[PDB]
Amino acid sequence: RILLNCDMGESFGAWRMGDDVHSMPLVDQANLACGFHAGDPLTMRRAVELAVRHGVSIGAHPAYPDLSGFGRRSLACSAEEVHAMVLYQIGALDAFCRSLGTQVAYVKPHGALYNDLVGDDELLRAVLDACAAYRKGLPLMVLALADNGRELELADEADVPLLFEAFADRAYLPDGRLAPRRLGGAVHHDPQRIIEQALAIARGEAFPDYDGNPLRLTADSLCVHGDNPQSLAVLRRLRAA
Amino acid sequence: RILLNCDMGESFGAWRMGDDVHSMPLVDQANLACGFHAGDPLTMRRAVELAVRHGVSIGAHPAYPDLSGFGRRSLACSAEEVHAMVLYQIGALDAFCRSLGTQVAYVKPHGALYNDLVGDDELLRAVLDACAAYRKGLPLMVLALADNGRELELADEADVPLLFEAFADRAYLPDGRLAPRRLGGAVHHDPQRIIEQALAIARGEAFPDYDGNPLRLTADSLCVHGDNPQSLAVLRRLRAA
Amino acid sequence: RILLNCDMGESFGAWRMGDDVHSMPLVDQANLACGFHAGDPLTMRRAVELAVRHGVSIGAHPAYPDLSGFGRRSLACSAEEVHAMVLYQIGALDAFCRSLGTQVAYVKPHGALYNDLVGDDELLRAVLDACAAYRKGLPLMVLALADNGRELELADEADVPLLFEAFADRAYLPDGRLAPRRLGGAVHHDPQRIIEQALAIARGEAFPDYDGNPLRLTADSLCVHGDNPQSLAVLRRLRAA
Amino acid sequence: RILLNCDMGESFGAWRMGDDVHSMPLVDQANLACGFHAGDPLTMRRAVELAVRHGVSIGAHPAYPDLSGFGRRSLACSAEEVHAMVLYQIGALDAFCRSLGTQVAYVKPHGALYNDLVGDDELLRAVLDACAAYRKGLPLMVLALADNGRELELADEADVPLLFEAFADRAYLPDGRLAPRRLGGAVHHDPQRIIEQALAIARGEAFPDYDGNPLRLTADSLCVHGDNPQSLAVLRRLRAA
């Protein structure tokens, strides 16, 4: 039923992020960095080889140009700037994919860019259009909400398929958005809390939001973070299914 | 007969380099930056649109990762690092090309990378292999010499076509290499000197090297720099032909 | 009476910004880049030598880390991140100042950072505290408004002197803020409009805002941009006085 | 007798390098990154607070501008470029030191820059002069050799004190240089080998070089790498003394 995704290839130079070798065999979808928040060219090659080696679907994980902030800070870019930096990043990653006989299978924006799309029509249009410009049929992954009507409508105008994503290890606000990271309790560090939220989403059942009040979602893809070490050491919830 | 090339799309953010709008209509080949020495994504889009608009053939102009040095400083990278950063840059530029119904037609390394290939077999192999990995038939542009036997042999092993390039506005050393920029007289600022060197190459006739001694070359492509303002204001030597 | 300021040392690597050699002798205050939006170390050395050579007061011109955006895009940083990046940049520039027998005489934030301080108490506190941490008495330059009561109060808490700045070549909104650059008419390109706005400020007289309605300011410092070529070719309004 | 040094504050954004919290209490000297190979401003603040908290002497650890290469790749910069980037980095770090009531106590170049000084008089002169320009008495740390006559002479011309450094966890070539990292066996991963080499240096006794042949050194400072996990888990050789 629901697919597991995970942000990977987020190492950079001599610095390691996550634990891609462990997480790759457990997920369906690898959202790989494209050098703007992480993932230098050699790291990118390695992330793709590792994904290819485990049969995992590769998404482009593009970000704002902000290495020191890990692409988790909103940067007030024009739609024109965003279109071009998405296109650039998709093509850079796809170069490695094709040398390894595969291709970029979807796009999942990283960090503040991903969250800025939830409230900004002009940025989502720009991102959708970059996807369509690159390849007919290339899906964009966006935040599942109770009502995804705005996203469905814009995706229709651009003729881009959408993948609706939910999160196992992030606290949700009442309004359907994710709790900002600049605030305690935004990431779940209780493994049992992560498992329960994940399975509530998998089943379309209510789960506790940030304030412990019930929130209901259904999603095509479920994100688990390799950054988060508890979400790592509990990742064998693939077996729960 | 001989094709004119020129390094373009080398602006970056708010900073302008060259004069692409003037130089583009006068050349056959536009070597476009890929974001490592110059050419942010929006600049890249613009350089491609401008090239497309004038019927000019687009080459990828990849460099070492060195913005503050404009990619003109040798960086001791591994062959593995170089392979990946070339592949990355070709794919980033090609994303813009295909959105505009064309494609990257060749590769010309920029700056120190280009010159480091003249003496380093392992780097040239890595660069040749990146070209082959990206697309069957994608040529690499290299420095024309009296004897290009080493390059022909490695290109044959990789099955990559070669384009032999000479320079109108750079002083040559007796040994066939270009005079390093960290030394006066390395760039011609006498327009008449530029025209004469260009036409000596176009005709396969001898021209004065760095020390005024005669050097003979024949080449498939002739580089003129838009950086260099005299080489710009003398660029209507296209008409000389 | 009123001092002229100008953003300078904003070249970066091989790229030139402004025309520092012309503008430096005409101004009282040189707001020098610190490597985050512009101004690599060698450019910084050169900007300081040029300022020293003309008797001009040197300010640190710190920005968000955003080279491709020229520091003109708001980046959602924490107060902690902003404090540290200001301190870093002041110390980097001051290293060159002291090697040349002078010192950083004030701080003027660049780009989106400068404008984000007008509405964000927590960022202004962080910036004020970086100034105080670096040196007792080091002034911060901020946007002159009709009422500067919020800034005076926070500056008092930090015990940092304030310099109130107005702009000759930027259109003002009715509310006292500058018109965002992502909107036509934000920069004056009519030289006569620039001269008139400058002298209205110099005299404390009303001038036309963005919508041509009158706005009154008095300021300790008047900014003229070397980016802006009309504001450059009209800069001999120093003589108007 | 001999002082222990260790490269620290080499984390960058969300990426962690080393284990500064463990290594700081065991060393005499903390060589802190300055943002060119590692160490963003907030990481720098943290490294300084941690050093201050444990009574450790703080050195500036400046590098070539090369984040993706961790400053371990030689970059052909001019002496002028190197002078300025050293000065810049010393001043950036010193800003944090002084806000915490201390100061930069010496300079140790990082990565390829450090090794390039061993063979390049013009770069060592430029680096020595940056030290002297910043502060009278600020020592430069350089590679201890059998004969340090070239370094002593240039340091004398610049009137900069020298600290002679040896390495516990790096293999030495017969000629006194360190084995390049682009070659197996360059870093010791045998803890006992590290302890023995360290104590041979501490005592001025011979130890096995890269080829197992004896090499004799005496040094003022002994480097142990927090990068290297075996050199970390054997760092309680401070107690050996």
UniProtKB/Swiss-Prot annotation, chains A, B, C, D:
The keyword DNA damage does not apply. It comes from the Bacteria. It catalyses: 5-oxo-L-proline + ATP + 2 H2O = L-glutamate + ADP + phosphate + H(+). This is 5-oxoprolinase subunit A 3. Its EC number is 3.5.2.9. Forms a complex composed of PxpA, PxpB and PxpC. One of its GO terms (molecular function) is ATP binding. NCBIfam families: PRK05406.1-3 (NF003814), PRK05406.1-5 (NF003816). Keywords: ATP-binding, Hydrolase, Nucleotide-binding. InterPro entries: Glyco_hydro/deAcase_b/a-brl, LamB/YcsF/PxpA-like. Catalyzes the cleavage of 5-oxoproline to form L-glutamate coupled to the hydrolysis of ATP to ADP and inorganic phosphate. GO terms for biological process: carbohydrate metabolic process. The keyword Hydrolase applies. Belongs to the LamB/PxpA family. It holds the Pfam family LamB_YcsF.
